[model samples]
Target: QVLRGTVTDFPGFDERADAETLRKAMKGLGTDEESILTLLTSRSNAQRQEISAAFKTLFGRDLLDDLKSELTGKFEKLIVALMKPSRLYDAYELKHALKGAGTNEKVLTEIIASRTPEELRAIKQVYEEEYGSSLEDDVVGDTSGYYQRMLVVLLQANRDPDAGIDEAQVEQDAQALFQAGELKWGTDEEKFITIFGTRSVSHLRKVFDKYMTISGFQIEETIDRETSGNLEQLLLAVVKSIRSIPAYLAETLYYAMKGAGTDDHTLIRVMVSRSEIDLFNIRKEFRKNFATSLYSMIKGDTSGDYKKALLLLCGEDDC
Candidate 1:
């Protein structure tokens, strides 16, 4: 929905030169961080994949292995994140979230609830192929209650994309949501899950607008009052994303970098995921919402090559 990402498809790119330059950077005594950042961040993800392939064929070397051996710390993290296809990167994040002792529900929610149906399709295929297990099976084991239900439904990746506006149906769903949450004795969360999981994003936006008109509260505020815990947060994330994913992701970037310390995982995830998706709008929303630049924020919060790598993805100040 939000196409304002800084990294668009760069047409007519030369992956061969990019591959050679990357090889030179990593082959030397000390890795040339500047050359690596400039080339990797300047090209689109598809271009980078081409470079990786070219590098492997040209030098008989695995570019990722080379970078992993040469680079260290957050810089290594950034390089590795850049090297993979975004879908595989996403699958990797999901795999790590589940494999860890306690679940990273936040990461799970961010990835699951925010992606388009098509994107989800690719991720599921990648997950199954890579893990030799179903994403749904793992999610079912790791999560519980309606949270699991929501994830399962979304895992099907069947949300209707081109669903037409049933104006009367919209009102019915909106009213049903109101009755289930704001007007009910107890919140009916499954009701919330059903509407969010099934309806098209465009259709949900209509429902949300109608809800505010009738309930004297935004759908998000209503959910905040009516529900609690991970499910509520996930639902709110869904609504926010449906309304404006760039804005939602921008807010994610803000919180990831805010407070006493950084949430490097979130920072890396959002930067890499949105780099080719909606980072420009995310940067704009960050400044519009926080009255500061993402560039300066990264500068203040992070150090060394990590900082530089993030800045390169965050793009120019105006971006």
Candidate 2:
């Protein structure tokens, strides 16, 4: 639903100039962290690719390789993330999450539930080539139970992108949901999952609305009451994303910043992934819902080079 991303104002963006500046930044006694952050964050992914190519051509070395050697910590991580195509980057993120001792199941579920079928297909293709195993294999190895079922459903691309609402079917499903929930004994988790997985966003919204009319309970509330753990989270994310992807992301950003300790992984993941996608909309939603700027929140929570990189990705105005 979000249309705005980074504010584009560079009238004549010189890729070589930006590339040269970057080489200079890394060539110094101390890396010019601010130069790297400002130049890269202002361009779109496609533009970044151009600068990257130019950087290699100009210096006979890869920009990413240089950045990796020069930069350290979260600052390095954020810059490296920004350099790739978004789909490939997501594939890497999921792979990184799965390759360690314990799986970052939250990252796995978030990507699986929130991505479109086309996007997921691309990620799966890259994932297999990158890891020498299928995304499904890694997922199965790292997870089990009902949570595995949900992830497998999403991973297999069972979702129908062309799903259209059958008004009659919507009515039937809504009532079925009620019967499965407040109107019947026990909760029919499978039925809800099937509906959520099979239907399109357009149809699911109507189903949720019709469900509320019949049962007087939001679908999210019903899911929370009926399910637990990763299953509940995936269902809620799917439903909420179908309603409004930006709102779902806004909530994610909010919680990542909220409470005692900051979830730097989540903060970086969402911000970097959405930088050229719906981040501006997430920012707008953040301000409207949180009554404070996303900029101010990050400023309060982070420090040093990490803070600079995040703020630049947010753009000058929002920062």
Candidate 3:
């Protein structure tokens, strides 16, 4: 079980009223930017979907189209992203990452590695349906070598969630991992990929513990030494996600805000996508690891309407 999210269904929600409010907010000479941000950020995504439908029924205009025309920059990108259904948004982001001259490998690793098997299946289904191309095919065409192989395995979405761990098998797998990396002259990338990719999180946790005892090094340590580039990132992501997904996300959120100019896209995507799912837990983890609150980070890193919207979605500061 996980902690609650920051965004919840709004009390006394009336989609028609919301639709009208939004229409009025956009209709006048200057957009009521504050009202738009407050209303949209407060409502859950499902609530937003209802408002979208109601907006179309009442006004015969797409809410997203109107919002797109009214808003600009990172603020626009964020609001637009909020309107998409979760899985559709995942598919859309994945499609964007896979296309163009260079792959957004970080996006690919983050989405592909952290999502549940069922979530991955839904994303794959939507990707093919919306883009008219198989997600697997796109991944294969874009990535190569062991990295491609690991991605393909994850794309299969075949991890057995219900599988019980066997102590005997845990030791065996731990030793296998040790042999594949530390105990051997050359790393066996396929071995690392198969065990990490196919096992349940519960099972992997046991294997990791046993591996630590056997190898005197953490699994992450071995992977770091054994791999490089995209392959290294994907493998490390799998390990981090298995340990604590909230912690992994907290780290991602921290990095997006740590440097000179923020990684606005990553920050927005994580905040929006996880708002209704695990943003609260991410916030908790963020405070625990970073020695400061995510709320404060956003306040310092962003400005204007964009900052206000993010703060509202962030709900409250843990500090």
Top-lDDT candidate index? 3
* Candidate 3 pairs with clashing backbones: none
> Over the stretch 1-319, how does candidate 2's per-residue lDDT look in tens digits?
3367753535588999999999999896888888888888777787888898998889899888899999888888888888877658889988888855577877887788888888889999999888799988888888876677778887877675656568998899888877766733236666767887877778878989999888787877865523457776777788878887777888888889898999888998898888777889889888888888888998999989989889877764452
Query: TM-score of predicted model 1?
Result: 0.90
TM-score of 3: 0.94
lDDT of 2 at 161: 64
**All candidates: TM-score:** 0.90, 0.89, 0.94
Over the stretch 51-150, how does candidate 1's per-residue lDDT look in tens digits?
Answer: 9999999999999899898888988998888888876988889989995359999889998988888888899899999999989999888988888888
The candidate with the higher TM-score, 1 or 2, is 1
Measured with C-alpha atoms, the lDDT of residue 158 in candidate 3 is 89
For candidate 3, write residues 1-319 as lDDT tens digits. Answer: 7667788899999999999999999996799999999999999899999999999999999999999999999899889988888769989998889864598988989998889898899889999999999999998888888888999999999886857668988998888877876643246777778898998899999999998898788888855523467887787888899998888888999999996889999999999889888889999999999999999999998989999999998999887
Q: Which segments of candidate 3 are over 4 A away from where they belong?
A: 183-186, 223-227
Candidate 2: misplaced stretches above 4 Å? 7-11, 161-164, 179-188, 223-227, 316-319
Q: Which stretches of model 1 miss by more than 4 angstroms?
A: 8-12, 162-164, 183-187, 223-228
What residue pairs clash in candidate 2, if any at all?
none
